[PDB]
Motif scaffolding. Structure first.
Motif, short mmCIF file in Angstrom:
data_model
loop_
_atom_site.label_atom_id
_atom_site.label_comp_id
_atom_site.label_asym_id
_atom_site.label_seq_id
_atom_site.Cartn_x
_atom_site.Cartn_y
_atom_site.Cartn_z
N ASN B 1 -7.34 44.22 47.11
CA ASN B 1 -7.98 44.83 45.91
C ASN B 1 -9.44 44.87 46.18
O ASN B 1 -9.95 45.87 46.68
N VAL B 2 -10.15 43.76 45.88
CA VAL B 2 -11.54 43.55 46.18
C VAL B 2 -11.67 43.45 47.67
O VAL B 2 -12.65 43.89 48.25
N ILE B 3 -10.60 42.92 48.32
CA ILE B 3 -10.47 42.75 49.74
C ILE B 3 -10.54 44.11 50.35
O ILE B 3 -11.37 44.37 51.22
N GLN B 4 -9.76 45.06 49.78
CA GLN B 4 -9.72 46.42 50.23
C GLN B 4 -11.06 47.06 50.02
O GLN B 4 -11.53 47.76 50.91
N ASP B 5 -11.72 46.82 48.86
CA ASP B 5 -12.97 47.45 48.53
C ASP B 5 -14.02 47.07 49.53
O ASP B 5 -14.62 47.96 50.13
N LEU B 6 -14.15 45.77 49.85
CA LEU B 6 -15.14 45.29 50.79
C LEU B 6 -14.84 45.82 52.15
O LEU B 6 -15.73 46.33 52.81
N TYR B 7 -13.54 45.77 52.54
CA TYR B 7 -13.03 46.08 53.86
C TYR B 7 -13.40 47.49 54.17
O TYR B 7 -14.11 47.75 55.14
N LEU B 8 -13.13 48.37 53.18
CA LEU B 8 -13.29 49.79 53.25
C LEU B 8 -14.76 50.04 53.41
O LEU B 8 -15.18 50.65 54.38
N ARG B 9 -15.57 49.41 52.52
CA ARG B 9 -16.96 49.70 52.33
C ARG B 9 -17.68 49.35 53.61
O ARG B 9 -18.31 50.22 54.20
N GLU B 10 -17.42 48.14 54.16
CA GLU B 10 -18.10 47.60 55.31
C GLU B 10 -17.78 48.44 56.51
O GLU B 10 -18.68 48.95 57.16
N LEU B 11 -16.48 48.73 56.71
CA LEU B 11 -15.96 49.31 57.92
C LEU B 11 -16.53 50.69 58.04
O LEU B 11 -17.21 51.01 59.01
N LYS B 12 -16.43 51.44 56.93
CA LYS B 12 -16.84 52.82 56.86
C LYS B 12 -18.33 52.96 57.02
O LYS B 12 -18.79 53.85 57.73
#
Lengths: 52, 62
Positions: B1-12
């Motif tokens: 959830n938030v994991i996805q949000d951070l994951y997405l945000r950082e990676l991208k």
């Protein structure tokens, strides 16, 4: 007197052996200079690489 | 959830960082070649030394 003489007889030959032997050993050290430069090159290469 | 949000945000949003090889060079030791491959010096040529030596030491056997 015979005792003194006998010692000197054996010496006369054998000393020539030692004479050669010493110079032969010295020759090995000449070649050792080539070795020494090899030792150096290895040390330098490793040092630069370690820093990298 | 938030994991996805951070994951997405950082990676991208970051995937390049500074990286200049030239700056690295300052911080490391320089390779330079060995010096003095000097051939050994030749000395005590001739029986000049030997004749001198036989004479020089008076005690040749005592």
């Amino acid at each position: 007197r015979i005792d003194s003489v006998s010692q000197l007889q054996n010496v006369a030959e054998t000393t020539k052996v030692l004479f050669d032997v010493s110079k032969e050993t010295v020759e090995l050290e000449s070649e050792a200079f080539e070795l020494k430069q090899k030792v150096e090159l290895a040390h330098e290469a490793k040092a630069v690489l370690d820093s990298w | 959830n938030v994991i996805q949000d951070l994951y997405l945000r950082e990676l991208k949003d970051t995937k390049l960082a500074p990286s200049t090889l030239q700056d690295a060079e300052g911080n490391v030791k320089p390779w330079n070649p060995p010096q003095k491959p000097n051939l050994p010096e030749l000395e005590l040529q001739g029986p000049e030394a030997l004749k001198a030596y036989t004479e020089q030491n008076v005690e040749t056997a005592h």
